[PDB]
Design a protein around this ligand. Structure first.
Ligand SMILES: [Mg+2]
Ligand SMILES: [Mg+2]
Ligand SMILES: [Mg+2]
Ligand SMILES: [Mg+2]
Ligand SMILES: [Mg+2]
Ligand SMILES: [Mg+2]
Ligand SMILES: [Mg+2]
Ligand SMILES: [Mg+2]
Ligand SMILES: [Mg+2]
Ligand SMILES: [Mg+2]
Ligand SMILES: [Mg+2]
Ligand SMILES: [Mg+2]
Ligand SMILES: [Mg+2]
Ligand SMILES: [Mg+2]
Ligand SMILES: [Mg+2]
Ligand SMILES: [Mg+2]
Ligand SMILES: [Mg+2]
Ligand SMILES: [Mg+2]
Ligand SMILES: [Mg+2]
Ligand SMILES: [Mg+2]
Ligand SMILES: [Mg+2]
Ligand SMILES: [Mg+2]
Ligand SMILES: [Mg+2]
Ligand SMILES: [Mg+2]
Ligand SMILES: [Mg+2]
Ligand SMILES: [Mg+2]
Ligand SMILES: [Mg+2]
Ligand SMILES: [Mg+2]
Ligand SMILES: [Mg+2]
Ligand SMILES: [Mg+2]
Ligand SMILES: [Mg+2]
Ligand SMILES: [Mg+2]
Ligand SMILES: [Mg+2]
Ligand SMILES: [Mg+2]
Ligand SMILES: [Mg+2]
Ligand SMILES: [Mg+2]
Ligand SMILES: [Mg+2]
Ligand SMILES: [Mg+2]
Ligand SMILES: [Mg+2]
Ligand SMILES: [Mg+2]
Ligand SMILES: [Mg+2]
Ligand SMILES: [Mg+2]
Ligand SMILES: [Mg+2]
Ligand SMILES: [Mg+2]
Ligand SMILES: [Mg+2]
Ligand SMILES: [Mg+2]
Ligand SMILES: [Mg+2]
Ligand SMILES: [Mg+2]
Ligand SMILES: [Mg+2]
Ligand SMILES: [Mg+2]
Ligand SMILES: [Mg+2]
Lengths: 46, 271, 93
RNA sequence: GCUCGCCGGAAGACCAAGGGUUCCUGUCCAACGUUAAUCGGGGCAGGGUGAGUCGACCCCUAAGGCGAGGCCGAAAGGCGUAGUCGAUGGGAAACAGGUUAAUAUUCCUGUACUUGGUGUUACUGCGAAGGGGGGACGGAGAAGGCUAUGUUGGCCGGGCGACGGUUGUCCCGGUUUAAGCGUGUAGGCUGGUUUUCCAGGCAAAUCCGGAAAAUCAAGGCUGAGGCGUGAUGACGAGGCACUACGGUGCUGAAGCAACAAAUGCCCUGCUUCCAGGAAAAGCCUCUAAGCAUCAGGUAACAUCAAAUCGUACCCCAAACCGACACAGGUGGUCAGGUAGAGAAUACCAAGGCGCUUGAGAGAACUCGGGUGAAGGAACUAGGCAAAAUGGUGCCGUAACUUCGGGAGAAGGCACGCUGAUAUGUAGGUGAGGUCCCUCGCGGAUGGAGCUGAAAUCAGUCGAAGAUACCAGCUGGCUGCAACUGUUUAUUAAAAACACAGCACUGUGCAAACACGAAAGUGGACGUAUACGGUGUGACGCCUGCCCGGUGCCGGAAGGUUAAUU
RNA sequence: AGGACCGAACCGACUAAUGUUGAAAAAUUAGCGGAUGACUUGUGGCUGGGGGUGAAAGGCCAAUCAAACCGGGAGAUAGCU
């Protein structure tokens, strides 16, 4: 039947994209934690 | 006219329509139109603050002249119109200088009638003047609360106010609620009653009809679980509560007015 | 509009294939690898100065580089710009 | 390669979203593929996506987001003004044919169109972040005109039949042609022009709005399709040469009419209703600051420019969401023939497939079906499941009823084919010829040709004519809920929730109430015929007694009583 | 005209059989209800955890919601096994 993941790149980027993370203090904290962990991909990008 | 529908279907049997043939057919006067934004009863935090608001037909806003400040310049009523934003009808009025405005349509006002505002205006229906110049005992509508602020009282269909006294810089009004209220005599009021008194004679007849008006269903607190409303649960139909609001506040009887700042203007409260 | 230093860096390589050979024989069109950032105006001017031939029209596309999996890790070839440079009726080179 | 079978409002084709090379060619087969695999969406290599006019970007805004200053908040932050972003909506312009192994409205051929820059020439009041117009708007319904498309005839090419007949009232196939340009039709809307005056359109206006005269009855605006051109062309069965037998080159007949006909178009129309139906820019016009032999505006011709990114392939699925090559899920577009009311259904066309283990056998038992003597609910918790009914027309139809209903109540009759009325009727459509004319895509007359249901009478075949697929079972008593709706996604659809209606109660607007330490906001650009809370639940006939208790409302004399002093 | 009637698409989910190490972590087949409306659906937006939203079933809030998920206090505590 209809599953929970229904893709949309616009909604993906608006909700979880780099700029969305940079827009709030807590989102810049997500990027900082991920950078300290040494993550290859900080966000889903192009 | 108030019209009953034949029972050709169950949701039609109890319908009682208010059909007014005097009202303009079609579109309103475009220059006096603004866009209306539907809320769903949600505020700037996106939370429902007023329940049961949602859906219902799209409506354009008509700029209504509640101030009636265009003094000395006479005007003719061009047509009466339906306004989805209020119970009352509106009148498209043409001033001698070429300006057009919308006004609340008083009882009896028709196309061709001549209206005017100002301290000197004639005592006739549709005319606006400060209440210091309107005789005591007169029936008025679209009453200002502060001078020049605009009409705030007796705006709904069939409503009116009676100037029962004048003393000093103030008038005493018998509001439609039955309240005796003091307002300063320099506040304007329009002669007559608001028209469309047959409005209260309508019977929606079905659930869909309140829905077209943007009214969403009311769930009885007793129909809920304890966690949702103080009117809680029970095994079968149970009450045994002192009736309250969803927030645990005494509904039925408890007075909620708390305005020491405006107390001085209330002569006698409603009954 | 142009500069020699820029025109000298804009044309990268002739592109060889069956499509490129048939484009030359049938339509007098040369198929090239051009700088990724190269514009149709730059490719026209560069071909005219360096190849000394008259250009009719430049058509361009971006080729996406293919991905190859090496077990758990991926490799990616580079995206590049292809130019279909049509020369006027009088053919040279 | 020849057959056979399946789908065909899809199991075909095309978009979007999402994926990302899966696309095409060569080569390979370990692993992947529920089997073998020489094959593959698998491995490896190479190739492949070509735009001024298709989309994005771009200009414009919607909900909503962000937001200089600002307002507010221990800090973090919240809100918000000017603004600035944000499509799922508005805004310039391209079509037909050919081509590749794989792209094409992108390449090529043919024929076009849009908006800017520059130049020349003739004419000229130009100018905005502003004004006005416009853009620009709902539901339902009606029926006329069309086209897409089909059918038949004609026309042209081919045929003369594996077995009785087949030179004819015979068979098969084709009969296709765009945008653009010209014409301004069926039809929709609206009276037109000039002059003068003006408390309105933040300032101005020659524009809009308002006022008053004069004059003419025809003026304009919108508009499908047709017709012409485009087209001297393209496409076109087939013929003739070469073939690496995959194909390639050359050549090329007819290309018309009548009738039927959308759910597409005229139509953002018309009619009608109440629930009363975005914005902003492009665009047209008007002026302000300003420039006033300049610049700028209008037109013709010439010339230049139109960048950048996307474009392969899958797409109702083996490529997307489902761990799988998974009977699941996934928005939009197109709509051929016969029968049919139909987009149902059956058979087919174009097109796509036989679903990636097969071979035998013909036990019990399980699954899914077909038929069944006599009986006919005896079964069982219960007719669960089956079986049955099933179409159109006409006749006919009870209690009760809120007069709508109940009703398709129930029950009955007819039903194929052939001929006659009439070698094809009623009707629909409509050519020639004649005549008029403000000569047109015109009007009247005229009825050829075409198409064409239904009825009666007579006859005829079968057991059976709504023959298949498809397609109501009907009736009586009674509980509950008025009704249509809603609900426990995944054991409950109900008598539960909601509902129109009724009542109580709060609320005078900076409303009560609600989200918020606040600012701000919803209620509401509403105003007591309004808004909130609570209960009851259409309608009919009605709703009695009790204020001791608990809750609430009102009271101020006395008693008791906080900080404070 | 109608929250009108019959009936595809579309939306739903009343009954039964099958399936229950499924073809499927809720389906398939035969029947069933709504089908101009309180209808249905695409794209985007807003509401956030004692919070939302709820025609109210404690329903739903990314496959177990009478208090989501993740990380942390954390080696909570466990007179129990
Ligand atoms: Mg309950
Ligand atoms: Mg209490
Ligand atoms: Mg080109
Ligand atoms: Mg390109
Ligand atoms: Mg690959
Ligand atoms: Mg392939
Ligand atoms: Mg194998
Ligand atoms: Mg491969
Ligand atoms: Mg700031
Ligand atoms: Mg803000
Ligand atoms: Mg913008
Ligand atoms: Mg868009
Ligand atoms: Mg292709
Ligand atoms: Mg010029
Ligand atoms: Mg404007
Ligand atoms: Mg309308
Ligand atoms: Mg036709
Ligand atoms: Mg023979
Ligand atoms: Mg006409
Ligand atoms: Mg040929
Ligand atoms: Mg393609
Ligand atoms: Mg496709
Ligand atoms: Mg398979
Ligand atoms: Mg599948
Ligand atoms: Mg679907
Ligand atoms: Mg079918
Ligand atoms: Mg299989
Ligand atoms: Mg067997
Ligand atoms: Mg038997
Ligand atoms: Mg028998
Ligand atoms: Mg019997
Ligand atoms: Mg028995
Ligand atoms: Mg028994
Ligand atoms: Mg049964
Ligand atoms: Mg059966
Ligand atoms: Mg007979
Ligand atoms: Mg009983
Ligand atoms: Mg019910
Ligand atoms: Mg129901
Ligand atoms: Mg359930
Ligand atoms: Mg159920
Ligand atoms: Mg009740
Ligand atoms: Mg009582
Ligand atoms: Mg008291
Ligand atoms: Mg209905
Ligand atoms: Mg089913
Ligand atoms: Mg039924
Ligand atoms: Mg139905
Ligand atoms: Mg959504
Ligand atoms: Mg601790
Ligand atoms: Mg532990």
């Amino acid at each position: 039947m209809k599953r929970t993941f229904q893709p949309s790149v616009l909604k993906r980027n608006r909700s979880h994209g780099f700029r969305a993370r940079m827009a709030t203090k807590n989102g810049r904290q997500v990027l900082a934690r991920r950078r300290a962990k040494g993550r290859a991909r900080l966000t889903v990008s192009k | 006219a108030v019209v009953k529908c034949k029972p050709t279907s169950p949701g039609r049997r109890h319908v009682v329509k208010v059909v007014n043939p005097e009202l303009h057919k079609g579109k309103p006067f475009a220059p006096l139109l603004e866009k209306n934004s539907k809320s769903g009863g949600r505020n700037n935090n996106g939370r429902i603050t007023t329940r049961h608001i949602g859906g219902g037909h799209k409506q354009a806003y008509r700029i209504v002249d509640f101030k009636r400040n265009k003094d000395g310049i006479p005007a003719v009523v061009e047509r009466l119109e339906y306004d989805p934003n209020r119970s009352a009808n509106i009148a498209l009025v043409l001033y001698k200088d070429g300006e057009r405005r919308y006004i609340l349509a008083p009882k009896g006002l028709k196309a061709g009638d001549q209206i005017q505002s100002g301290v000197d205006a004639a005592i006739k229906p549709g005319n606006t003047l400060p209440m210091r110049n309107i005789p005591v005992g007169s029936t008025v509508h679209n009453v200002e609360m502060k001078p020049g602020k605009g009409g705030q009282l007796a705006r709904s269909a069939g409503t009116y106010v009676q100037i029962v006294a004048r003393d000093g810089a103030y008038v005493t009004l018998r509001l439609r609620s039955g309240e005796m209220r003091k307002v300063e005599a320099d506040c304007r009021a329009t002669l007559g009653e608001v028209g469309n008194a047959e409005h209260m004679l309508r019977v929606l007849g079905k659930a869909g009809a309140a829905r077209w008006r943007g009214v969403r269903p009311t769930v009885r607190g007793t129909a809920m679980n304890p966690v949702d409303h103080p009117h809680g649960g029970g095994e079968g139909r149970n009450f045994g509560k002192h009736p309250v609001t969803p927030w645990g506040v005494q509904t039925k009887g408890k007075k909620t007015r708390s305005n020491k700042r405006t107390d001085k203007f209330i002569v006698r409260r409603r009954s | 509009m142009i500069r020699e230093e820029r025109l000298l860096k804009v044309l990268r390589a002739p592109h060889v294939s069956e499509k490129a050979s048939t484009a030359m024989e049938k339509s007098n069109t040369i198929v090239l690898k051009v700088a990724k950032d190269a514009t149709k105006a730059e490719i026209k001017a560069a071909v005219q100065k360096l190849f000394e031939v008259e250009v009719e029209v430049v058509n361009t596309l971006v080729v996406k580089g293919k991905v190859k999996r090496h077990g758990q890790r991926i490799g990616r070839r580079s995206d590049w710009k292809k130019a279909y440079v049509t020369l006027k009726e009088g053919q040279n080179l």
